[PDB]
Design a protein around this nucleic acid. Structure first.
Lengths: 147, 228, 90
RNA sequence: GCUCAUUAAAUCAGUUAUCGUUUAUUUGAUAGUCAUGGUAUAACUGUGGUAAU
RNA sequence: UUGAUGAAUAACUUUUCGAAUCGCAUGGCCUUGUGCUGGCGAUGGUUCAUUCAAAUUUCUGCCCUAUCAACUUUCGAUGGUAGGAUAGUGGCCUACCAUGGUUUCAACGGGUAACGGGGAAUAAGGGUUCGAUUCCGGAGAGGGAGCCUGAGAAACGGCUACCACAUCCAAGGAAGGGCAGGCUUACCCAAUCCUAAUUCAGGGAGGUAGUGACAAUAAAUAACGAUACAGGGCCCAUUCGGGUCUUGUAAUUGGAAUGAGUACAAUGUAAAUACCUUAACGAGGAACAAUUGGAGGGCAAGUCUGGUGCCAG
């Protein structure tokens, strides 16, 4: 029945708008039917996340933060074989900075969420692996992932 | 949609357009309106198609298989079912009227000549209003006269010259489609001849000489007019 | 059981069929389930069910009755020739 | 089929006139003046070029 | 007077057609070969007419204006004739020839927000004159210009340049024309009509359903009864006070009804969704558990502030 379905739809909009609503827009996915969704719903999803126009927030413009893309340990295995898995490991981490400029003099202290208070030891930027291009569509060569 | 079809405004948006044919398109009544709509023989538009392909209907001595086939004034429409013969005749109020006739009356029709000349190799010919051109007519047959047609062949069995004081049907104009048997013939600028008409109540009415169709003598009409 | 009344029994020999408006009376039941009428409209005549065709049943409001249109052909092989395909499948 | 730039005897409305014209389709008429000629497209068979059609 | 009759020659052509077309009937004569002959159609095809058109055309009928009286011959204006061009008329075009045209009866010129107007067309069975539909008029498909097919186009879902964009390249070349949105790319050809060789096939014509509650409407959240226990409940009054009465219960309790949901079929439809109809369930408070808004008091081994004890705030 659509009428019990449509009544359940407005019960979920008028629930969700009590908490979030800035113009908030939730929409309806069809089904997982083949490990995948119909392409119109994926387009309307990818449309709605492309017109989002984010505001900046108060905590994010005071604290330099980043998300770790890939995790790398840089220790000699001879340090590991001698000291016998007791060592605290020299670790290189990779990510995109955010928010405010993280100062490049090594020695600022900086906190992994869920590990503890650490400090930086050596800084190095790189060319980013996913560049923005440099009223046309994107060429499919230029849409590009990094995983 | 025109006036004389007696269609409702209901039952579907688009009006069934007429095909090109013998009659004029504004004078025509298509067979789709004739079967499913006024005579109520069929229901859907597709049901008209099944009647035509099985050749139930014959119009004026021909098979005549077409959905939007233009039927006009004075057309013998013979249906092989029921042994009934139909002749279209216009009604005074502005509309067409389907009419019952006999087998002998389904044999003949009347036809107004529109133009007469001399054909090739010295042959006279007259051209009826239904576009039936006929070789070797009577030289008495001249413009605006009616022609009785055999319909077994294309031959002419009777002819009535246009003379004042004979029972006239009107095909066109404002006062289109009455009896009234003649007052006289007027001349005017540009032609525009107004053949005057005085009805059963003896009232003057005025249409064009183009609209004049002689349906009989003072007294007798040659065809069975519908009485009501 | 059910009871049927026929109004405007009109014969159309072009399609070689008996048309009529069907006036179906529902004393208590719910409805009449058109296959049951194609049974009952057959045996009121000689029809051998599939030479009848009932389609236009819109109910009297509140129940109790339904009005529609019935097409009874002759020569049952003609039902394949003149009926539409969406009534052959019913 | 969509979109941009405003016309006062022009448009439009009816009316003729087409013996002033052209018309595929529609319909109606209508011709007395070698058991088989001669060609012809390809597909195909295989070789290649060209960043590419 | 009555009737009745009349009013092809000679040549030419980048020689067109005169059927190397099809279906039913299978018959007739003699030198008997599968010979000779022979019926009804159908389709072409020439020309004519017809209609669907299209092209010009006749005539009558538009809003304001003299603070526009002359206008035109100042791209022919009026006409004659001849040629050309065209499907054809034609000053359409050009030669040559005449000086005319419209006008106080308003020519011509100007204003028109000409979203205003057309009975173009039904419409509203009392909303007082409401509706919808159709018609505007012109131009364009990046801009100019020239062309080709076709009954129809001076066609941008064609070619040739030019001007300007703009994409692919291995640098030799190749190729291409904005539209919706901001401050559903679903189902269907049934109905409808259209298209076609045409019952069939097809139409993002057309209909169906989705995101789109703004606003506005008719319900429901409970009916009904017994028993028990208490004696007090309400009204008016500025104070004293007065008035009147079967009223009250965080009390037990009995059945009987029902749709808000839940849930088979049938109907509907092209198929559905939905409505309609209809079984099977489905009410006792922690339920199948509506809110917003106002008025008013009370409580602590509480806190704070003031005070001529225990109070006032």
């Amino acid at each position: 029945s659509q009428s019990t379905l449509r009544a359940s739809k407005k019960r979920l909009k008028h629930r969700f708008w009590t908490e979030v609503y800035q113009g908030a827009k939730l929409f309806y996915l069809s089904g997982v039917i083949n490990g995948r969704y119909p392409d119109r719903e994926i387009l309307n999803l990818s449309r709605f996340i492309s017109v989002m126009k984010f505001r900046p927030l108060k905590w994010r413009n005071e604290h330099p933060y980043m998300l770790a893309d890939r995790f790398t340990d840089l220790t000699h295995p001879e340090l590991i074989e001698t000291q016998g898995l007791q060592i605290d490991r020299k670790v290189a981490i990779y990510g995109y900075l955010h928010g405010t400029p993280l100062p490049s003099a090594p020695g600022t202290r900086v906190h992994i969420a869920g590990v503890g208070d650490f400090s930086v030891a050596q800084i190095e930027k790189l060319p980013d692996p996913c560049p923005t291009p440099f009223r046309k569509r994107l060429d499919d060569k230029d849409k590009l992932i990094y995983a | 949609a025109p006036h004389h079809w007696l269609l409702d405004k209901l039952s579907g948006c688009y009006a069934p357009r007429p095909s090109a044919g013998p009659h004029k398109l504004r004078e025509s009544l298509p067979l789709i309106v004739f079967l499913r709509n006024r005579l109520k023989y069929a229901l859907n538009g597709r049901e008209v198609k099944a009647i035509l392909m099985q050749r139930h209907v014959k119009v004026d001595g021909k098979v005549r298989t077409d959905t939007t086939y233009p039927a006009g004034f004075m057309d013998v429409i013979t249906l092989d079912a029921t042994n009934e013969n139909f002749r279209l005749v216009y009604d005074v109020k502005g509309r067409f009227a389907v009419h019952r006739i006999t087998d002998e009356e389904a044999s003949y029709k009347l036809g107004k000549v529109k133009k007469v000349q001399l054909g090739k190799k010295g042959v006279p010919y007259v051209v009826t209003h239904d576009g039936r051109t006929i070789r070797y007519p009577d030289p008495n047959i001249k413009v605006n006269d009616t022609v009785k047609i055999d319909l077994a062949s294309g031959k002419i069995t009777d002819f009535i010259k246009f003379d004042a004081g004979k029972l006239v049907y009107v095909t066109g104009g404002r006062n289109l489609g009455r009896i009234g048997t003649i007052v006289h013939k007027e001349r005017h600028d540009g032609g525009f001849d107004l053949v005057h008409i005085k009805d059963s109540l003896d009232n003057t009415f005025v249409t064009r000489l183009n609209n004049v169709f002689v349906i009989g003598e003072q007294g007798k009409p040659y065809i069975s007019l519908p009485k009501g | 059981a059910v009871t049927i009344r026929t109004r405007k029994v009109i014969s159309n020999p072009l399609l070689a069929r008996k048309q009529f408006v069907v006036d179906v009376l529902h004393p208590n039941r719910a409805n009449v389930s058109k296959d049951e009428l194609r049974e009952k409209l057959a045996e009121v005549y000689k029809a051998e069910k599939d030479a009848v065709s009932v389609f236009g049943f819109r109910t009297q409001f509140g129940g109790g009755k339904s009005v529609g249109f019935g097409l009874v052909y002759n020569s049952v092989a003609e039902a394949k020739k003149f009926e539409p395909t969406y009534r052959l499948v019913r």
